[PDB]
Amino acid sequence: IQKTPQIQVYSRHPPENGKPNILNCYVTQFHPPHIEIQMLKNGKKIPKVEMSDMSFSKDWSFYILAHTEFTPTETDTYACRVKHDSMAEPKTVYWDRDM
Amino acid sequence: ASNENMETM
């Protein structure tokens, strides 16, 4: 049986134009374990992405942290396309510097 | 250090 994923997009360091940073995509609460994660910018796939664990927690639900180096800007859109079996269609959360 | 399981399920 299947649990639906809770996605969060954010930055390691409080964004700042021109300053180096790393984009986080924290997926949570899912089941089964197979999941697919895509980092995107301007609708195109960020090429090098680095995934964490395949760990879980006390309620037995899995979690995963994906990340990529990125230089924040006012000119582009950054997103995280998740794809678990618990959803007919992929989900895509958008990076929003305010939260 | 890992644990090691005995009897199966």
């Binding site: 649990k3 954010y10 037995w60 | -």
Partner: protein
């Protein structure tokens, strides 16, 4: 400071490959430190901390020796459980276990853990007493009777009261390389308004460790719990965590709106 050591195991079947995916994953206090994955090209346990790199070969294979054992144990058990539930061969199954120990400030044991969960649900698990099991559902009783019989719990208890403790202690003692450190929160408020009656205040907190934190908005001292946007404590990717909490406000009232902050690694609650 209180501590823990954790092993997060997970077998997984998907069809068309009679050989599941096994993955163990170690953790000292809240920080990973070892990892195995059956689906590797060279399936071998690996360091994941810096302080772990300090072990040398006999250790590195005493563990991979074990991982290959458990790998076989999971393959076997996953099939057994198949029978207890009348699942026919043909779909995706999942078996997970979690085992570890906890020790107080005084370096002594507090609690052991050994617990399994089939399909994401609790299957069977070991009591605080380390002598007796709690079976969750009927099928879980087969295993229970089966295991009371074969004295499986002593072994467990032994690993938990002995080799878990004795081994953590030494993880602790090489452990300062992050373990015994307490990264304090770095808290500040945002803003972002527009609309009459709107201002949307935002108390952040950043860079802390451990993840246990409680941000609280307050009107004088009456906790502003109303429409408090609370975000799930998330990781930074570095060994720290983040969090924020919003509250909606009538624009210009910002004076007596104040989020306190709480954390083990702080002098006293950070008032903002």
């Amino acid at each position: 400071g209180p501590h823990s050591m954790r092993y997060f195991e997970t077998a997984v079947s998907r069809p068309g490959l009679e050989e599941p995916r096994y993955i163990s994953v170690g953790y000292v206090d809240n920080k990973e430190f070892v990892r195995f994955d059956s689906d590797a090209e060279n399936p071998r346990y690996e360091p994941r901390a810096p302080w772990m790199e300090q072990e040398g070969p006999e250790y590195w294979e005493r563990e991979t020796q074990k991982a290959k054992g458990q790998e076989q144990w999971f393959r076997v058990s996953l099939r057994n459980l198949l029978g207890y539930y009348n699942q026919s061969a043909g779909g995706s199954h999942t078996l997970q276990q979690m085992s570890g120990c906890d020790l107080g400030s005084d370096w002594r044991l507090l609690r052991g853990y050994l617990q399994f969960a089939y399909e994401g649900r609790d299957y069977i698990a070991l009591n605080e007493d380390l002598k007796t099991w709690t079976a969750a559902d009927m099928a879980a009783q087969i295993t229970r009777r089966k295991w009371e019989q074969s004295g499986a719990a002593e072994h467990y208890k032994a690993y938990l009261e002995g080799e878990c403790v004795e081994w953590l202690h030494r993880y602790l003692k090489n452990g300062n390389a992050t373990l015994l450190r307490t990264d304090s929160p770095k808290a500040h408020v945002t803003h972002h308004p527009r609309s009459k009656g709107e201002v949307t205040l935002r108390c952040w907190a950043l860079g802390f460790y451990p993840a246990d934190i409680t941000l609280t908005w307050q009107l004088n001292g009456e906790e502003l719990t109303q429409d408090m946007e609370l975000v799930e404590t998330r990781p930074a990717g570095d060994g720290t965590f983040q969090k924020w909490a919003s509250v909606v406000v009538p624009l210009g009232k910002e004076q007596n709106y104040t989020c306190r902050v709480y954390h083990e690694g702080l002098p006293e609650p950070l008032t903002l």
